[PDB]
Ligand binder design. Structure first.
Ligand SMILES: CCOC(=O)c1nc2ccc(C(=O)C3=C(O)CCCC3=O)c(C)c2c(=O)n1-c1ccccc1
Ligand SMILES: CCOC(=O)c1nc2ccc(C(=O)C3=C(O)CCCC3=O)c(C)c2c(=O)n1-c1ccccc1
Ligand SMILES: [Co+2]
Ligand SMILES: [Co+2]
Lengths: 382, 382
């Protein structure tokens, strides 16, 4: 059941912005680890005396890394005379965010038809405004409202129908064409102390609807746009369990609510994981410990009609997890945390089925892999 | 002339510590870019609830990357009950340092015979104390005094004659044996507003002596230990020049004095620069723009008795600079800034001559390359 109740026209995920202390080192690490190309910049070399911002792209996926310069470089500026390319940026907010949370996502940005209308309708329906609509070079409009914690939902709309004005394309000599197969952001997941009030708030101002699902330490629910291509799952911890909830660990180490993981769709998850795993110990990303062979022995009875024995052994080599709902099949794997704190991590996913284009959320989000991993663990103990 | 006036016994450079906002991403970037191995850690997995610290090694070179956790993780601790492995660490100091300066060196650490004696003698001779001597697991003693800006000179002494107590060796699966030929720290350079008072201060409390030298925007001088293996150059800006002093640009973007560059000795600078340059656009480090061919044409008359025509063409391919004093020859090159701000960078060097072992500072520090580059620039204009 999809009531298609969006209160304004939403297109697709546009970009994800990390707030950093040094944008250069995080961007360069991420570029090598994930196979993303340096495509645009806004920094001292482009006249930005306020913040350094570097954009990585892989297919339609856009990762932005931003850090503040010394305020003294821009102490003479006022908002009318700012050299910042992202006018919502604030030195104090950014330093407060990074000191509170460490490295993490500040903005989940979605493209809309009309960012000024989206902002107005959202705030009229309970959204807490974060940065009012601002028109950049008469071409792009950006506005921000609070999503959860210190994470904002960023609306971006373009008149034309090239990232943002004041960003410059990166010199091809500095722009190496890395590509490990990642193509787009599939979903973005938040952790909160209380799921109910978080859902009521976000569904309240967006009109997003609850996306149908099928001892883990969590309760979760997924908000979706009309065509279910913008997917925003939210988790709360379940307390009193034998094993401590990873949602509660997140909230403690993050100093509260924030973005838990980014799920990145790959057009070939086997190629992506081969390429990422080759770089784990040479500057890239690490992956969670693989499931036992019993898990992959049990893959025959569950998805033997979807993957061959060879495609299943390839899953075992790479530690890929597999889940399935009534519509389709999900291949997924999780990285270890991206930075110092046990907070944000990345998911790589590929979805099989639901062809009409592929419909959103085909195969679900892998909640079956909680019980399946418990089973395979005790089963492998033997 | 070397009076050998050290006021306490100094051995060698021990390590360099960067203060970071996220130690993981900087360490992983540096490891790939410079070919350094992950060798030790102190973090949540080792019981450290205060700071995350990761050590990279290449030969005798030790780079330490440290970032603060949320203070809430350790809010119940007191200094007697601390879980920090580096007891001088302070959350507030570290956040204040990174917000003021961005990514940079907090500590230049030298090994001494007796860190408690070095601290006492230094402070008795004018050093500003930063952290008093503390004995770690009855095995290592660490003490810190102010060097310049917010950079400290760190004394480390060992009873035995394994980095620091509470650090753990890194699992060999997570420890990839990268090596591009870098072997040790040759010198560490500071930028200050006023060279005179900075030299008087540091020479005052160490007994280090001035190391003999042979429109650039700087005045400089080099302080050296008794065997001239600890080398601490210091720069001040020269104002009123046609081209703005890079020392003044450093001071402005850094919010004052601090460490300008680290010079890393390579056992084979050609291999090091081939390996680093292959990785510049895939997560590693960039190099300053190469000198014109006239510079390399003029390399015949200056060092033709030291390098063959083939060893000189190899310099031209890699953009290596060459200088020479009355004792030996210096091959060197400079990276672009390591992070967002035009502040800290790295020098790669190899020294030829002065065999007795090789004596310290053989060939000087390349101050001849200022005039030689001006000449080659206008000469290449032609
Ligand atoms: C035994 C370990 O493996 C697991 O059970 C496991 N299954 C998962 C299945 C799915 C998802 C996921 O994507 C997600 C959503 O997108 C929507 C809302 C619900 C949700 O959770 C995630 C994060 C996990 C996961 O984090 N874990 C895990 C991994 C290591 C440590 C502890 C837990
Ligand atoms: C025309 C550009 O090249 C250059 O003239 C140049 N020569 C250098 C020669 C030597 C040293 C050096 O190591 C150092 C010491 O160790 C001891 C004290 C004095 C000192 O300076 C350095 C940093 C440079 C240097 O930074 N530059 C440069 C590079 C790009 C931009 C502007 C200046
Ligand atoms: Co997910
Ligand atoms: Co130097």
């Amino acid at each position: 059941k999809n009531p298609k109740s969006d209160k304004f026209k939403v297109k697709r995920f546009h970009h994800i912005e990390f707030w950093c202390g040094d944008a250069t080192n995080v961007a360069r690490r991420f570029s090598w680890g994930l196979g993303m190309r340096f495509s645009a910049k806004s920094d001292l070399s482009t006249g930005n005396m306020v913040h350094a911002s570097y954009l990585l792209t892989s297919g339609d996926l856009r990762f932005l890394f931003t850090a503040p310069y010394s305020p003294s470089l821009s102490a003479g500026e006022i908002k009318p005379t700012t050299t910042a390319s992202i006018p919502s940026f604030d030195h104090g907010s950014c330093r407060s965010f990074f000191s509170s949370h460490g490295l993490g996502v500040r903005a989940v940005a979605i493209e809309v038809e009309d960012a000024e209308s989206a902002f107005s309708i959202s705030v009229a329906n309970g959204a807490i405004p974060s940065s009012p609509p601002i028109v950049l070079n008469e071409a792009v409009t950006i506005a921000e409202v609070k999503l959860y914690g210190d994470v904002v939902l960023r609306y971006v709309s373009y008149k034309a129908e090239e990232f943002l004005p004041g960003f410059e394309r990166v010199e091809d000599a500095s722009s190496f064409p890395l590509d490990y197969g990642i193509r787009r952001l599939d979903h973005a997941v938040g952790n909160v102390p209380e799921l109910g009030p978080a859902l009521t708030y976000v569904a309240g101002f967006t009109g997003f609807h609850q996306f149908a699902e099928f001892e883990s330490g969590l309760n979760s629910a997924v908000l979706a746009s009309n065509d279910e291509m913008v997917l925003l799952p939210i988790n709360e911890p379940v307390h009193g369990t034998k094993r401590k909830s990873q949602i509660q660990t997140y909230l403690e180490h993050n100093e509260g609510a924030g973005l838990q993981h980014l799920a990145l769709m790959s057009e070939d998850i086997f190629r992506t994981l081969r390429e990422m795993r080759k770089r784990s110990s040479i500057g890239g990303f690490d992956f969670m410990p693989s499931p036992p062979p019993t898990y992959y022995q049990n893959l025959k009875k569950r998805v033997g009609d979807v993957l061959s024995d060879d495609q299943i052994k390839e899953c075992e080599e790479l530690g890929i997890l597999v889940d399935r709902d009534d519509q389709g099949t999900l291949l997924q794997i999780f990285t270890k945390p991206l930075g110092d704190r046990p907070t944000i991590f990345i998911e790589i996913i590929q979805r099989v089925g639901c062809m009409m284009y592929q419909s959103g959320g085909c195969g679900g989000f892998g909640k079956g892999n909680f019980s399946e991993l418990f089973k395979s663990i005790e089963e492998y103990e033997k």
